Structures are given as C-alpha cells and as structure tokens.
Design a protein around this motif. Structure first.
Motif, mmCIF file in Angstrom:
data_model
loop_
_atom_site.group_PDB
_atom_site.id
_atom_site.type_symbol
_atom_site.label_atom_id
_atom_site.label_comp_id
_atom_site.label_asym_id
_atom_site.label_seq_id
_atom_site.Cartn_x
_atom_site.Cartn_y
_atom_site.Cartn_z
ATOM 1 N N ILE A 1 3.102 4.041 -5.790
ATOM 2 C CA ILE A 1 3.822 3.019 -6.544
ATOM 3 C C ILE A 1 2.745 2.198 -7.237
ATOM 4 C CG2 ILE A 1 5.310 0.982 -6.332
ATOM 5 C CD1 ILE A 1 6.808 2.319 -4.027
ATOM 6 N N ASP A 2 2.991 1.729 -8.456
ATOM 7 C CA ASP A 2 1.970 0.959 -9.162
ATOM 8 C C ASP A 2 1.540 -0.282 -8.413
ATOM 9 O OD1 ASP A 2 0.207 -0.401 -10.940
ATOM 10 O OD2 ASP A 2 1.286 0.449 -12.653
ATOM 11 N N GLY B 1 8.961 -1.107 -7.096
ATOM 12 C CA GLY B 1 8.038 -0.946 -8.205
ATOM 13 C C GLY B 1 8.251 0.360 -8.925
ATOM 14 N N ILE B 2 7.261 0.761 -9.730
ATOM 15 C CA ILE B 2 7.309 1.981 -10.523
ATOM 16 C C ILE B 2 6.516 3.062 -9.817
ATOM 17 C CG2 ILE B 2 6.472 3.100 -12.591
ATOM 18 C CD1 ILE B 2 8.318 1.574 -13.737
ATOM 19 N N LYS C 1 1.273 3.109 -1.245
ATOM 20 C CA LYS C 1 1.085 4.484 -0.827
ATOM 21 C C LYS C 1 2.300 4.843 0.020
ATOM 22 C CE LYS C 1 -3.753 4.232 -1.158
ATOM 23 N NZ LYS C 1 -4.605 3.568 -2.224
ATOM 24 N N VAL C 2 3.201 5.665 -0.505
ATOM 25 C CA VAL C 2 4.375 6.069 0.264
ATOM 26 C C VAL C 2 4.105 7.360 1.034
ATOM 27 C CG1 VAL C 2 6.856 6.088 0.251
ATOM 28 C CG2 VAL C 2 5.630 5.074 -1.634
ATOM 29 N N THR C 3 4.423 7.344 2.323
ATOM 30 C CA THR C 3 4.092 8.453 3.210
ATOM 31 C C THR C 3 5.293 8.896 4.026
ATOM 32 O OG1 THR C 3 3.572 6.902 4.976
ATOM 33 C CG2 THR C 3 1.718 7.649 3.607
ATOM 34 N N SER C 4 5.145 10.016 4.728
ATOM 35 C CA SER C 4 6.127 10.500 5.689
ATOM 36 C C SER C 4 5.601 10.249 7.089
ATOM 37 C CB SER C 4 6.358 11.994 5.487
ATOM 38 O OG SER C 4 6.858 12.607 6.656
ATOM 39 N N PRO C 5 6.487 9.866 8.014
ATOM 40 C CA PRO C 5 6.011 9.640 9.385
ATOM 41 C C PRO C 5 5.705 10.929 10.139
ATOM 42 C CG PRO C 5 8.369 9.152 9.203
ATOM 43 C CD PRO C 5 7.930 9.613 7.848
#
Lengths: 229, 223
Positions: free
Chosen positions: B44-45, B22-23, B123-127
C-alpha cells in the motif's frame, strides 16, 4: 432390563464470539479437539488495541501531571490567603483549574480501563470446557463485535445426557447403552433428576439419563439404545 | 482392507486483508503461486504513513530532551538536599515539572507506536504459508481498513486433510486410479457427527510434499 430408543445430547453448549472487532491473527485449536475454558481459541490482532491502550495511558500521565501542578498552586495560594500577597478571586480561579484538571484525570482513568478491557478481549475464549467443532472463520478473517454467526461452538462432552422415551401404554436406578447394534458403552448412567417431561396430545413420558463420558467417546446427536434396571 | 470414499480439504485457510487504508502500489505475487507467511503480498502506498512516523519520532526526541533538562534540575535539588535547607515548594515544583516532561515522553512514545503500527501495515501479508488464489484487487486500487471483501485467499496444501463419510495407516487412490506416493493417518481423536442427518465424519491427514493433491478433489481412501 427394558430397552428404549434414545438420543444423546450435550450437557452444556457455548458459542465462541468476539467481543471486539478486528482481524483474526491466529486460530489456536484443531477443529474437533477437546478445549479448556478460558484458553485462547483465536487471537485477534492486538496491535491497534495495544496502541489505544498506550495512548490512553499517556493521556492519563499528562492529566495527572496537570492535576499535580494545579494542586501545588492551590496549596501555595491557600497559605497566602489573608495576606497582602493574594486575593480570593485568584484562589477561586486556582480552585477552578484544579477541579478542571481533576475531572480530566477522572475521564482519563475511564479511558485507560476501557482500552485495557478491549485489549484483553482480543484473545477470544470459550466460557466452558468441551469439544470444539469446525471453525466458521478462516485465519485473517474480519470479525465484528456483535456479528450474527458464531466463530465456533463448543459442547461439553463429559457428563453426557441421554433422552429416553416411553408411552402411557408402556407404563440407584441404573441406565446403560448399546452404542450401535451390539457393543455396550462401558459407563453406567443414572437418571439426572426426580423429574419427567409429559406429552400433551399423546400420553408419553420422556426421561433424562446422565452418563459419565471421561474418554470423550460419546458425541451428542447420536441415536442410541438405552436400557433401565 | 477396503475402500471408503472421501474428499480433500485445506489444512489451513487465511484471507489477506488490509489493516490500513490507501492505494495498492504493487502486487508482489503471481496468482496461483506458493507464498510464505509474512512476505509482502501487496504494498500500500506508504508516503503519508512514513511522514507521520518520521514526524512522530521527531516529537519524541524533543520530548525526550526536555525530560533530560527537567531531570537534571531534580538531580541538583536532590544533591543539595543533603547539605542545605531547600524549600519543599521549590523542590515539589522541580519534581512536578519532571513529572510533566516525562508524561510528554510517555505520550510521544505512543504516537510513535501508533504511527509505527500503521506503517508496518502498508506491507500486506498472509499469516500462513500456502497457495494464493486470484487477486480480488488490481494494482492502483483503493483499499480500506475493514472492507468486506478480502484481497486474496491462501490455502495451506502440504499437509492435506481427507474427510470421509461413515454409516491407523490410510492410503489414497487419485481420480485417475493411480495410488498416492505417501500415505496418511486417521485419528479417532477428531470426529464430526452431522446431526442434521445423524452421519459420521472422520478426518484423515496426508503429506503433500509435491503439491499434486488439491483441495476439493474427489478421493478414494483405503484401510
């Protein structure tokens, strides 16, 4: 009482490789630590695979429902054959639906098992127990099934091998080591097998000793002094 | 008690990657800042992903309600089975229809899960928690599930490794000559034997509460 130059080498080596693609959720080992076979070394994020599993199980459930419903209409029709109330084409059609539903059940079972095994392979493991090295992959890394580079390498550190050499000129059987210019490895080794390696160009005899290494203190790839009783 | 030179490396590293295409709607971190695991780093949208999910859940409810109708029918048959002669046929039919309505539920739950799992990935995250570097992607960028280059890299700093080369309390001297305020430990546990050379390597470990130490900086260890 006769010492020879030697190299230590691993009894068993295995590469740690993913059998399934995805993102590395977590690394479960410290680099350079002792590892047990079958223990989860890396967890590939299983969310999408869990889903494919739940999906395939849902296609199975629908298929078994469909098969059961068609099976019931075959039974109804079968007991009406030969009476005013049904015809052979009608029954033959019900038979066809059933078979069709049954094939679907077949394929669905296959889909479940496939997706079950992909889920299981999201925990990445080593086939052998041993000392694991550096990880070649960071957490959150994209790994692909079949990629070139291994994620890690494990080396079986107990029974350790020691390759020993003597010239043609040089020519129960105890072997022991001087570890690194003095101190002697407190384990005694023997020769592994009634077998040698002979060099083609120069007449030479390479022997292999096997040492217990329970304290995991020997490493492979070590230049070592070896003596034979 | 003398000196053996070393270099510091990160205790943990993680790449930040999208698991959904996505964007990039927003970037939520400043570059070079300290981040917590599980915090949204990029959004991300989610519009289409939300729509699917809401939609899926709608289906589940409908499927669930139909199962309620079929189950109610089976109950009636059951309750009358102690009192009347009831056709095995009419009964297996009710059961068969309940089985079918239930299967639609099982199917619908997985469509909710599939949709739920993608939405979560917007929702992009770091582990891991750590220092985040430059972002490889600008806001409004197209990101793809499975793309080669990572969006960003985060490096855990607070316990830092010091690696040393050879031919228990450990302390440090930084590049300027000043001593490091908290001292570390060396384990005979972890090792490495560079066979390409036959060289030894020991891993040291130091607290880094003040984040002053950085990975890749040349260090002087004591013993």
């Amino acid at each position: 009482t006769t010492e020879l130059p030697g190299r230590t080498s691993a009894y068993r080596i295995a590469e740690v490789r993913p059998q399934v693609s995805g993102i590395i959720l977590k690394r479960n080992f410290k680099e350079g630590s002792d590892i047990e076979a079958g223990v989860s070394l890396y967890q590939i994020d299983p969310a999408t695979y869990q889903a494919t599993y739940d999906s395939a199980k849902g296609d199975l459930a629908k298929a078994q429902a469909a098969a059961n419903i068609a099976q019931l209409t075959v039974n109804r029709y079968q007991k009406l054959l030969g009476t005013q109330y049904i015809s052979k084409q009608e029954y033959d059609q019900a038979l066809a639906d059933a078979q069709q539903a049954n094939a679907a059940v077949t394929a669905a079972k296959a889909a479940v098992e496939t997706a079950r095994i992909n889920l299981a392979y999201t925990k990445v493991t080593s086939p052998i127990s041993g000392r694991i090295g550096k990880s070649n992959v960071t957490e959150g890394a994209l790994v692909q099934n079949g990629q070139a580079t291994a994620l890690a390498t494990v080396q079986q550190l107990d029974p350790i091998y020691v390759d020993v050499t003597q010239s043609s000129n040089d020519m129960k059987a105890k072997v022991s080591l001087i570890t690194s210019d003095g101190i002697k490895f407190p384990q005694d080794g023997t020769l592994e097998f009634s077998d040698v390696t002979v060099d083609q160009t120069t007449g030479s005899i390479t022997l292999r000793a096997i040492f217990p290494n329970p304290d995991h203190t020997m490493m492979p790839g070590m230049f070592v002094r070896a003596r034979l009783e």
